[model samples]
Target: AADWDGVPVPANPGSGKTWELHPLSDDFNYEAPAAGKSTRFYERWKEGFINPWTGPGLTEWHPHYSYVSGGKLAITSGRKPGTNQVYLGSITSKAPLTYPVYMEARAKLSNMVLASDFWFLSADSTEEIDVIEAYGSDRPGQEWYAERLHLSHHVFIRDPFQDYQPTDAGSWYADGKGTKWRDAFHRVGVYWRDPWHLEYYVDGKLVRTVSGQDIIDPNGFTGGTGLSKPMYAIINMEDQNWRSDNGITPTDAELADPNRNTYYVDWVRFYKPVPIN
Candidate 1:
């Protein structure tokens, strides 16, 4: 296990360092006012022009999602009158300056739901680094896990939703079968080092790790295509697709509930490593 001593600190809540919501965002419409921390990072995701990846929901003002006044971001299912997938809101720090940094967020979720996530995206393509992702199928039961993308169709160059391939090749690394994610708040962290080194932690405890050497070939993602460039971080609430044995293709009953099992984010912070001696 690695220590946080050498990591960088970019946005620290203690120091009052925070992020401003980015314009030209996607996933949902309505941009975060030029006020406190720009909330949504997408330029507004639509059906045809959307970022491809593993998760649930379509593009454009997607579905019933909201940010609460309690300082928590809530993604919920609606009490609507039709059969639609319940999608949550997600924000990403995709700027080149937001990479190789120590990032964490506090979150909570309901039972039998896909709770929360603090994931990273490869800037060049859709290669993913699922820092913290959990399934809330059983409260007090540890049904959480992490994913490492070895390959996928959304690898390089943004493609319209049509040509997107959700799964190319990946591995599911579970910290423990009993790591229940909904019982309380969790501070998940990710240390993504260039040339293939990713470390994961749950509630400040070391849990899982991935090495580029193990998953990729020599010069696997070297140069610019590799893990050398900047990446994005997202705090998202997921749907059934994230936990279902098959996929989060929601049933009619689930989507009708205004409050179904969903993920909730308390807050997110990005930090740079402490200055080296």
Candidate 2:
């Protein structure tokens, strides 16, 4: 049997005060304090910036976003015309975990237009691990689909964007025009094993797996070597950037229409190996 801790709250360093870390199983699921209207309204303070190393001049907090009562960290699109920006929700663990760790989150999407994502990034900001990202659910003119296993081993990809790497593989809809993401809430996972092998799963089913050999040998990217470092968890609500030439900018239509573009997150969980096991 798996040991459960429910929701674990982190203590605020300055004030010996204990912030409520509502367990996923509890009624008081975590939600960010709401913000009233403002020309530059944003998510509340505690839900604000946490990363001190954001390369300077860039505040880490995403604008127009917050954690809702449903135990979800939510991001709403900003009302900027032709803007490709979406609400970005993120959290990070201070300490890094080595290979053989299991990280998972329960997530759902709103309406049928927005794309919801769960991803991880290296502490030093050099590499990115995209566990599961669902895109294109809103416009039927476009294809709506969910991806179970997607990873980007930036460390070893000699040129990730330009050159193609073999480890770069993800499962998408064969028709390229189906809406499967709206079907149900799915569990997404990213499992890594030390020097090279990485596995991706969706709803406990393996979707795709990548070995270190595929990345380092021909792609020239260093496999996950010293990646024992802690990574951050990020959940984002994005517009149909894949369809728009400039990308989906949050407009009045997205926020007002509760059915198509809104993003929802049911719960987030991280499981570590039992020390005594």
Candidate 3:
């Protein structure tokens, strides 16, 4: 592991003078049922209506979609036709994330027409950073395909009459080559430098670097507001209904096969940058 300054990260949490470790680290090495729950540090997302950026193929977030098995945490989705073709699985952190932090996860995604996302969220406002968005199905020309992963940063502005509309001000990055995210586990990480830069990585390799100025500011991005507020961490698996028309629908056959419709998470960790004196 490495710190923001390019130095070796201390093994012990409190041993470092500048950086301190957060208590949200988990290895998913617990027993079933009782220890499987993430309630101590995470709240399983539960909703009754459709979520944003999602199409009609999804049901509200539910705990039934989340479970622990075989020493890993799994988020499962099942088909239910027009009502809820896809059931979402997500867990939100109990505490808000501090700025200038390093976040990482070790996981394998589902092989259906879905997405696995590791991101930061602030419900009141649109302050987000999607470290990685891995898709389960193939998209020929899209940034995210079943063969590649994508990253994005967003800041939404509140409008009086129109409600919260996207400010067209965001940065996106995708793996140029290709990947098999659902075949095996991989390490995904992000270093959020706040107000200026964000670095993304996969398997210890640097993938992209984004700066504040690099974001498109079509609507001025909420009067030049950056992602400065503290936000909660969210890990979710969702269906991509837009792909349904493009031969990427989540078929009943795939949903019936647990081996293909489940997202497995080995662990998740968050690290704050050491404050400089």
Candidate 4:
């Protein structure tokens, strides 16, 4: 059912370009180990972050909280029994994506005040692309975010902690009538057309497009390199800082509710460009 032209990802690869499934793509159809590495899943992805520190908001990235069962991958955010810490699920690909690449994932968001993300980041922690940053919760103050998705990219400098991302209308999307993002498994994707061009798609529709040095190299942030580095995919869930600052954390009772937590990813596909007829 899924094929190279599934959503017309190439959009425009000029001429003689086509898509081929990259080896790193996953359908979550295998049995992944609980506490250790999985040759099937873990072979392509490594659990938790490579760096130290308890994750962004209220969760600590741990392998135990990430599960692949019932033919889906669920990134859970739950408490540590009696402590204030919450263990969240996270995974990053080991190999950088093969470019002129396109990535798409069929995912459902968590009903708790948590973020479900599908993104890419370089190994050296510089170039980044947020294919989807969607929240799905019916809790108070979360309705706004639950109905929309955030599509963005970040260019960073390690020396002084400076970052740049376009602050414009193209960075956000919705179905026009406030469709609940978590109510269904929606497709979110992006295609990197070389270092200077990028396009985003949501529910099979072209939501936004960016190109050229003005949008990619504004102020020469990448030192004129743009997004030249190869990056790997990352899928995870957490209680981000903005939400926590707004008191949008899972309550004791909500944490115990089975249906309130868990971000479900049905599958993720990656494609690389090659010559075609």
- Candidate topping lDDT: 4
Report the C-alpha displacement of residue 207, candidate 2, in angstroms: 2.1
TM-score of 2: 0.65
Arranged by lDDT with the best first, the candidates are: 4, 3, 2, 1
Q: Candidate 1, which ten residues in sequence have the lowest lDDT sum?
A: 145-154
lDDT of 3 by residue, 174-253 (tens): 34556567678877887776755677777767776666554623356646656667777777776655555455666677
lDDT-superior candidate, 1 or 4: 4
Candidate 1, overall lDDT?
A: 0.45
TM-score of each: 0.60, 0.65, 0.76, 0.91
| Candidate number with the higher TM-score (1 or 3) | 3
Rank candidates, TM-score, best first: 4, 3, 2, 1
Residue-level lDDT tens digits of model 1 in 1-277: 1222343332332234433333322222233431232434333221111255535443122333544434455555442244344455555554533445555656665444444555666565445555556555442333333221111212333354222222322334334445445666666666554436555555666555555543432323343454554556655656543345555444555445545445666655555544333
The root-mean-square deviation over C-alpha atoms between each candidate and the true structure, in angstroms, is: 8.5, 8.9, 5.6, 2.3
The better candidate by TM-score, 1 or 2, is 2
The CA lDDT at 143 in model 3 is 31
Overall local distance difference test of candidate 3: 0.62
Give lDDT tens digits, candidate 2, residues 1-277.
1122443322111234332222222112444444532222122223332355321111123544554555454544433345434444433433344555555666665543454566665655544566655653545444423422234443533234332334433434222334355455656666655546666666666556666555524444334343444555555654443434444333466655556555665655554443331
Query: What are the per-model numbers of colliding residue pairs?
Result: 28, 13, 2, 0
lDDT of model 2 at residue 54? Answer: 23
lDDT of 3 at 76: 76
